[model samples]
Target: AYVTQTMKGLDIQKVAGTWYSLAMAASDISLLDAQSAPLRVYVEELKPTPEGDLEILLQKWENDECAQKKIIAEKTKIPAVFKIDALNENKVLVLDTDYKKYLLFCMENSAEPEQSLVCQCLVRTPEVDDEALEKFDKALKALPMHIRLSFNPTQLEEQCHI
Candidate 1:
């Protein structure tokens, strides 16, 4: 089994904001490998439904336009563990975060190991500080051996639109 961890008492309010996709890795295929264009994700809002589930408005840049996706993240018994119904039985884990500069997220499907995915997001800034970069490297090392990591070009600002 793949080992994963999540932060405790993760306040969703602190995580509600805009974030940029700095780097991404997956067990299946690299989403940022040889990308023709840039990618950005905007976490519009996170609200709790009557059933105590989270309703998230996630927006991403696709084809030069902001594509919106409504994600209903069902809270699991474990803190910071969220399940997306559309993503099979995969569980999204909030690996780590400062709620100001950088955040790490991982999605793993126990049933289908091939669906495991991990990615890190930064604030609005295009560049990550040395400290953050080092932390990201360490986190990537925790992933399973089958997973392959890829990084965006250094000139991501030029390739992607803010």
Candidate 2:
């Protein structure tokens, strides 16, 4: 007999681009395979749209021949989980639950693109790592507090209780 289980996961949605890494570590060699940045090590941002999709904005690196902007396709029910390996420290790994697809675009700060960046992360489980929070905090440091990407999962408990 086969037993069924509820495969719980985070629901990913569209938001604005936020910086991630200023440099890629040696360990990220596998992850960097698809990337083609000359000075490839620099801060990156994830921008989301209201239609519920993500856009990758790479900065601090330069490559006139390559496109500067990329849009990551949206996941239906499955979430692109970000598992934090550590918190209050460096060296962490973010994993995605489902295979992700991407699109490409090009724009600058003054251009006023079609979307905005929202500070949020989707996880497969209820648990969240402090390191992920730190990453979010680090991304927000470059932008003003008012337009920062922010969320509080703990509040879910209250909403559920009600």
Error of 2 at 28 (Å): 7.8
**Residues 13-102, model 1: lDDT tens digits:** 666555555555555443333332121234444455655466656566555566666678887776578787643335777777777777
Candidate number with greatest lDDT: 1
Q: Residue by residue across 1-162, what tens digits does model 2's lDDT show?
A: 321112234333432434432112221223233354222322245655655454545432234543355435443443332211111111111221221222111111123212211223333224344554554445434433322222255532232122
Q: lDDT of each structure?
A: 0.57, 0.32
Candidate 1 structure, TM-score to reference: 0.66
Task: Provide the lowest-lDDT 10-residue window in model 1.
Answer: 31-40
Best by TM-score: 1
TM-score of each: 0.66, 0.31
lDDT for residue 11 in candidate 1, whole number 0-100? 71
How far is 51's C-alpha from truth in model 1 (Å)? 7.2
